[PDB]
Design a protein around this ligand. Structure first.
Ligand SMILES: C[n+]1cn([C@@H]2O[C@H](COP(=O)(O)OP(=O)(O)OP(=O)(O)O)[C@@H](O)[C@H]2O)c2nc(N)[nH]c(=O)c21
Lengths: 12, 180
């Protein structure tokens, strides 16, 4: 539904 | 970039201050709540690291409306995947493991078993630091064991290293209901 990978979270 | 990135769930960060003169529940403190990626980092980047907490203190991250205690309706039939860490590497590795755990939660890494996740807790302790994922129902074998396996993988624990799940009811009255 709303998922984020570890790399998507960390690039913020 | 200009729009915030929503999380699936709103989460609450709690802090437990070791103060023996008060009851356990009174030592809990709601720090803040967030429901976007940007707001997660704004919180995380400006609070003290787990490795710099006094022994006996905790951080907990739980879905909005679930208090980080056994007694909550969403925890009382549930349990935890428990990781107990060696003291030597706290400076080097506690913070990394806790952040990896936070990212598993907020990113919804547990796939179709996301609803079973309640939260996670890090305990800073003289006898060994602990990190745990709390789930809602010890009887939900499929959910509990999937969460276990994904968590073990995300921490980088090898096939040899087995972790265990125990019910909160058993802890509060300890053997493993499940292992992965
Ligand atoms: C998670 N939790 C901990 N406590 C209290 O805090 C004590 C310590 O529980 P702890 O989880 O802080 O473990 P610690 O490593 O300090 O000690 P261990 O028991 O050897 O692992 C418990 O014996 C309870 O009195 C709790 N008390 C209540 N009422 N509810 C909770 O959810 C809860």
């Amino acid at each position: 539904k709303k998922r984020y990978s570890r790399x998507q979270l960390l690039x913020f | 970039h200009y729009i915030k990135h929503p999380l699936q769930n709103r989460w609450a960060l709690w802090f437990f201050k070791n103060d023996k003169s008060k009851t356990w529940q009174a030592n809990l403190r709601l720090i803040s709540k967030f429901d976007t990626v940007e707001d997660f980092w704004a919180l995380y980047n400006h609070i003290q690291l787990s490795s710099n907490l006094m022994p006996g203190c905790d951080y907990s991250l739980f879905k909005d409306g679930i208090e980080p205690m056994w007694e909550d309706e969403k925890n009382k039939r549930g349990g935890r995947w428990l990781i107990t860490l060696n003291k030597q590497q706290r400076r080097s590795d506690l913070d990394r493991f806790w952040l990896e755990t936070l990212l598993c939660l907020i990113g919804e890494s547990f796939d179709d078993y996301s609803d079973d996740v309640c939260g996670a807790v890090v305990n800073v302790r003289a006898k060994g630091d602990k990190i745990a994922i709390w789930t809602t129902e010890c009887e939900n074998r499929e959910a509990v064991t999937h969460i276990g396996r994904v968590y073990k993988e995300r921490l980088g624990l090898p096939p040899k290293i087995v972790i265990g799940y125990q019910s909160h009811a058993d802890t509060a009255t300890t053997k493993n209901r499940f292992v992965v």
